[PDB]
Structure 1
Amino acid sequence: SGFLLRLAGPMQSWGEHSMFGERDTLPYPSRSGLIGMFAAAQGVRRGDPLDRYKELKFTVRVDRPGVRLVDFHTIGGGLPKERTVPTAAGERRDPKKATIVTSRSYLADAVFTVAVTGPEADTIADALAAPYWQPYLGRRAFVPDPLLVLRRRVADPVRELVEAVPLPHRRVEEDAATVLVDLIYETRTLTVLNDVPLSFDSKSRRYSTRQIRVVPTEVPATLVAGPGRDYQNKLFTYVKQ
């Protein structure tokens, strides 16, 4: 069982621990987000039991860490006072203060290839191919790369993360081999953060911590693609086989 999910695209955000106007992303995908991505693909209404998703495992290798950028993002500004965001008391604030100013962060030009291994993950892959709601990378405005699922069915996909999945253009030294790539596994634990989603109900979303261990591993330098456009070519060669 298992399939390869490729998270790529111009921008993707995987925030955790932010609860005000400023938003912040983890430099790598968060299990909560990917689980919600599958739940959205399967029609799981907000508030439905998320234990079906329990028992999955997410090893994620970071091809390009990507640049982290902060996207300004106002809400309601430049509108007449009557048509701005409501207050909790119900009376709209004065128009010179009715604007909301959020500073949301997002990863741009970053690409990870998570190898999801679970009990029903093959039905989940078959659900991403025909989604109930549009899958997106973190914020809904970010739209996933068309090669969202590199392979629908793979026996031992981590074995395919160690090798035989192409890689972006990187420095390849003379007489070099085995270019270093950071794999992320789920003592030797990088960080602890609230990921595993106890409930997605918008009224009270709650989570619990998951330790992450990031192990730099060594994959053959043959894997990295040539400088220009070759990455797309090798990747497409990869999807048909």
Structure 2
Amino acid sequence: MRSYLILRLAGPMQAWGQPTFEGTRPTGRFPTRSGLLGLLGACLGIQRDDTSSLQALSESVQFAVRCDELILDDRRVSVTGLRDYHTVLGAREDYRGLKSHETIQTWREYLCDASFTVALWLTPHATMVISELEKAVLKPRYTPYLGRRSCPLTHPLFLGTCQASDPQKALLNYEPVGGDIYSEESVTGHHLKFTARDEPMITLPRQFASREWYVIKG
């Protein structure tokens, strides 16, 4: 009934934001919508001030994310967290001028042994088509990464492409299956939702608005 594009987000370390105006840079347990939009937006060659392309992309695309657990040599590997004491010396003191601090400090969280499988699709009001997306994921223009520019990918961004009615049902054709799924689209059997602040308000640079995931447990 509906065509789906299937991506795979996996690497050694991963960082997906949470609300902060401070130096601690938190991470949640699975990719943010602002994050995914940023990733796609990055494969596509979309400069930061191109509010039009940003909006186009945002209103076109919708995501459902599945959390894959790692099995190594047949032992299960939970996803763990990491805190990095990250300093900067010569950091700017004001948004204008050349005076700098001697040293400033930030703490940045990363996810370890995290691997995700994402399914995306087009909305009724789309300005784009899926094979633009596919074409980009296969040949990105800007460097792609999992959260921060220091987190490469260990697997190609493109996993596959299929069709079905559910995002769930679409995800069922790509292993490993059994993970929890967080979808923008409701699934009849499941009533649980997960509050977030993923939505980037394009009209207002670097600000985000509340939204809710639909939770389909495995």
Structure 1 length normalisation: TM-score?
A: 0.72
Residue 39 and residue 213 in structure 1: after superposition, are their counterparts in 2 closer, same or farther (change >3 A)? same
Look up the equivalent residue of 1:159 and give its one-letter code. Answer: K
Q: Offset at 1:56?
A: 1.9
2:135 is the counterpart of 1:133: no
Aligned to 1:237: none
| SS of residue in 2 equivalent to 1:208 | strand
1:97-108 counterparts in 2 under 5 A?
98-108=102-112
Taking the aligned partners of 1:200 and 1:154, their CA distance within structure 2 comes to: 34
Show structure 1 runs of 4+ deviating over 6 A. none
Aligned to 1:182: 180
Q: Offset at 1:197?
A: 2.0
Alignment partner for residue 121 of structure 1, among 121, 125, 130?
Answer: 130
Q: Offset at 1:200?
A: 8.4
Aligned to 2:175: 166
Q: Percent identity?
A: 34
2:92 is the counterpart of 1:86: yes
Q: Offset at 1:87?
A: 1.7
Look up the equivalent residue of 1:215 and give its one-letter code. Answer: I
Residue 132 and residue 72 in structure 1: after superposition, are their counterparts in 2 closer, same or farther (change >3 A)? same
For structure 2, list consecutive stretches of 5 or more residues without a partner in the other structure: 70-77, 185-189
Structure 2 length normalisation: TM-score?
A: 0.78
Look up the equivalent residue of 1:184 and give its one-letter code. Answer: Y
2:152 is the counterpart of 1:154: no
Aligned to 1:232: none
Aligned to 1:199: 202
2:87 is the counterpart of 1:68: no
Whichever of the two has the greater Rg, that structure is 1
Stretch of structure 1 that moved more, 185-194 or 116-125: 185-194
1:191-230 counterparts in 2 under 5 A?
191-199=194-202, 204-217=205-218
Q: Offset at 1:189?
A: 4.5
| SS of residue in 1 equivalent to 2:36 | helix
Taking the aligned partners of 1:207 and 1:189, their CA distance within structure 2 comes to: 23
How many matched pairs? 191
Taking the aligned partners of 1:193 and 1:160, their CA distance within structure 2 comes to: 24
Q: Offset at 1:137?
A: 0.4
Look up the equivalent residue of 2:169 and give its one-letter code. Answer: R
| SS of residue in 2 equivalent to 1:181 | coil
Check the 8 A contact 2:55/2:202 in 1, yes or no.
no
Alignment partner for residue 64 of structure 2, among 49, 59, 62?
Answer: 59
Q: Offset at 1:180?
A: 4.3
Check the 8 A contact 1:196/1:210 in 2, yes or no.
yes
| SS of residue in 2 equivalent to 1:107 | strand
Taking the aligned partners of 2:19 and 2:208, their CA distance within structure 1 comes to: 10
Offset from partner CA, 1:164-186 (integer Å, 9 cap, x none) = 3222xxxxxxxxxxx84311122
Residue 158 and residue 121 in structure 1: after superposition, are their counterparts in 2 closer, same or farther (change >3 A)? farther
